[PDB]
Predict the structure.
Amino acid sequence: ANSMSVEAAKNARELLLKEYRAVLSTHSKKWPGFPFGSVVPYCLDAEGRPLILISRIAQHTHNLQADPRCSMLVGEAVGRLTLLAEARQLAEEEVAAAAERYYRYFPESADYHRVHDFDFWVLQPVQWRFIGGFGAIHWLAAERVPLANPFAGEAERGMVEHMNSDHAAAIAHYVELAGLPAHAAAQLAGIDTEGFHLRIGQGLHWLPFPAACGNPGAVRQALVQLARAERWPTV
Amino acid sequence: SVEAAKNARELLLKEYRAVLSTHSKKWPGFPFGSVVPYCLDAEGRPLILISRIAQHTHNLQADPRCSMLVGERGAEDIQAVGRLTLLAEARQLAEEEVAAAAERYYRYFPESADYHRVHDFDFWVLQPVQWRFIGGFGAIHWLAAERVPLANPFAGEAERGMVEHMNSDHAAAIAHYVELAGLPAHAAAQLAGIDTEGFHLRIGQGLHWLPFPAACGNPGAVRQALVQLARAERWPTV
Ligand SMILES: [Cl-]
Ligand SMILES: [Cl-]
Ligand SMILES: [Cl-]
């Protein structure tokens, strides 16, 4: 379709899901003519696009205010993904839903958008470049990489809260099976059609379902299957 | 500020991979990041070795103004550590500068040896224009071009000799630095280089900076600091 490039797009998205830290490159406003590298944590919004919470006094915020064009570099050796994007600050109506998902990924950030001078921005894709550990270069159109999350919001929140409240034992099984860090017990942070995030201390990790899950019942089935598994199933 | 400049240089010394952002030629108006290894030159500036066919090389050729981002390694809360953004002008070294660059850089990155003109590669120095340092608590300091780098009076043949002799004669002192410090122990550490404030160990892929108790301006002062660390039961206060 071509098959390599469809594989590449999925691999790109998996890398995007598996990380929660990126290097943002922006045009320096304070120093015209210079690019500017900064670090940002992120999660994905309902449409599968990077969502950031950035401070009004941060260089990268001033830079995006003057010129929304930027790139994000995210790592897996080693596979690497570049996103070319136009950043947009979320309208007031968009903030509640951003905040709810972002604060689940980053609970120590809670209320920062209200009490401190932080705002949510979304990176709107213009192009992606995925390079595998073997060095195969795949340039991909804007819409090829993101995958919408039909759970984002209320369905997801109920799923995550029930898992953290009533199925901590199963969560321990996932960590064991995947060989994740065990300095603290894990909690679910979020769920998408392809997998789920666990937070472990500071500390985010993505795990794939054995197959895609389009509704909460399919998610239940995958999680039960994972909890009973003796090794991580593939595909 | 004085605190800030020192802490900035400390991070620069402690790291060996940075994110270089350049003006994109392929997609004008989008800055592109790439990961580059680096060490510091005799003047304390970043020295990189980049392929004639790499995109970031074509980018720097068309516009040498760039950013280099360094930050504490493996940080899970990435905004709870210091980060340093260097704004710089990249300059390809003249033929007269190449030998001293290769000799130091190849000590830091042995696996690269003679990639310059068996392979596609040339040495470039990042000439500082401005630094933006953010501390672990989130204080922002903008620093002048010359505020952060400190020259290394050992760079080249003095250093090469001190390092070669520590590695041949004092493997035992080196293993002890490793124990005292951190620090991976499967290999067998080698000294990579020495500066007035500290020294680098390679293990084995694998670079690590360790401070002297106080700056050492001459080779007699570095021997002293290295003897003290060898006999030290715990790492001393700086
Ligand atoms: Cl930063
Ligand atoms: Cl800043
Ligand atoms: Cl650009």
